[PDB]
Amino acid sequence: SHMLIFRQLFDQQSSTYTYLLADSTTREAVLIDPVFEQVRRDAALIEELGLHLLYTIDTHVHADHVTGAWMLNRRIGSRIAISAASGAEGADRYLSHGDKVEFGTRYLTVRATPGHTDGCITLVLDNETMAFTGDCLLIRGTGRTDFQRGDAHTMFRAVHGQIFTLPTACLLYPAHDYRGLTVTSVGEERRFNPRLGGELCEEDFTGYMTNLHLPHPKQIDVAVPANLKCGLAEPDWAPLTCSFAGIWEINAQWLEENLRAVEIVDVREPEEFNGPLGRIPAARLISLGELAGRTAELTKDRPIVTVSRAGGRSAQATVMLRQAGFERVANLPGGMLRWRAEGRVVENGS
């Protein structure tokens, strides 16, 4: 009913595109092809957008990366969805041709598009302005057809029957690109795809694919068994969360209840430290511009929380401390301003 929230995310290691969709009317969301290494990033992004993740959806059983479907299920309670035809065990919902994956007022429709694997699906947005083609159709290309259940004939018929029948202007988002491309469309691939577009026939395409010899994915021996189980098999010195920017944040309530358990490093200027906002009791003053050169005064025996006026300069303090070998470091988000606004203890205030 209202605007669609859409985010394309890239995993540099496997060149995988993850896709986040959500209805802004209800903030309910789905996530297509989440990457295991990217679980903290993806979950942080969902949190910062105020979203509720109903489903992870895997287009097929991947050979190049372990999916995040299980880790996200465990951590934020999202449901695992994958095709029935893929044969993976441990999912909450098996998908078949014509299934409708709802999120709020919006939905995706499932189209079976095997060829790369016999479980590949393509997800079509309700208004058919975009679709997610997994490794079936790629940007000016296709998925490989040469391992296990791969079949070039099946892929050709899938692309022509299920994808080239979408609207001409419909955008197509693939699970991978290796040249820095992000999207294509039905019209472009139908006309310019060099393997099965234009006037190429089924025989032309299969002859191409039977002579395409690509190295196996680097993670193949690890990923496919892991993904047949939907991705089955973390600082704990304080309750920590990692922001989308990548900064480790401490829970302020826990910090006030355990100030003796940590070293508190105030990176403000000397005037701010003795100034009207006050300081957190027992806070060590090492101004940010002095911090890098004085890291030998802090002990690795005890974790370190950085504080500044509003949490900005202290976030940068965490990066400097990590680059100097410190591991148990965290930022106090919102800084002295939020500490005071939440009525927490300060010395020398006003």
In the complex, the residues that contact Cl ion under the rule CB under 5 A are: 308-310, 312-313
At closest approach, how far in Å is the CB of 297 from Fe ion? 51
* Minimum CB distance to Cl ion smaller for 109 or for 316: 316
Q: Which is nearer to Cl ion, 160 or 284 (CB)?
A: 284
Cβ 324 to ligand GSH shortest distance, Å? 34
Does residue 23 have a known ligand-binding role?
Answer: no
Give the burial class of 15: count Cβ atoms within 10 A of its Cβ; 0-12 exposed, 13-18 middle, 19 or more buried: middle
Question: Binder to ligand GSH among 34, 68, 104, 143 (CB under 6 A)?
Answer: 143
Rounded least distance, CB 134 to Fe ion, Å: 7
The neighbouring-strand residues paired with 245 are none
Question: Minimum CB separation from Cl ion for residue 31, in Å?
Answer: 33
Rounded CA gap, 150 and 160, in Å? 17
Asked if 114 interacts with ligand GSH (CB under 6 A), we say no
Residues 262-321 that bind ligand GSH (CB under 6 A): none
How many residues of this chain interact with ligand GSH, rule: CB under 6 A? 14
Residue 75 assigned to a binding site: no
Answer yes or no whether residue 135 interacts with ligand GSH by CB under 6 A.
yes
We find the least distance from the C-beta atom of residue 138 to ligand GSH, in angstroms, to be 6
97 is in an annotated binding site: no
- In the region spanning residues 31 to 90, those forming contacts with ligand GSH, defined by CB under 6 A, are 63-64
Q: Which range binds ligand GSH by CB under 6 A, 51-59, 74-82, 166-174, 209-217?
A: 209-217
CA distance 12 to 178: 10
Interface contacts to Fe ion, rule CB under 5 A:
135
Partner that binds at residue 141, options Cl ion, Fe ion, ligand GSH, none, CB closer than 5 to 8 Å by kind: ligand GSH
Q: State yes or no: residue 119 binds ligand GSH (CB under 6 A).
A: no
85 binds, among Fe ion, Cl ion, ligand GSH, none (CB under 5 to 8 A by kind): none
178 is in an annotated binding site: yes
> According to the annotation, is 300 in a ligand binding site?
no
**Residues contributing to the annotated binding site for Fe(3+):** 60, 116, 135
Residues that bind ligand GSH (CB under 6 A): 14, 63-64, 116, 135, 138, 141, 143-144, 176, 214-215, 217-218
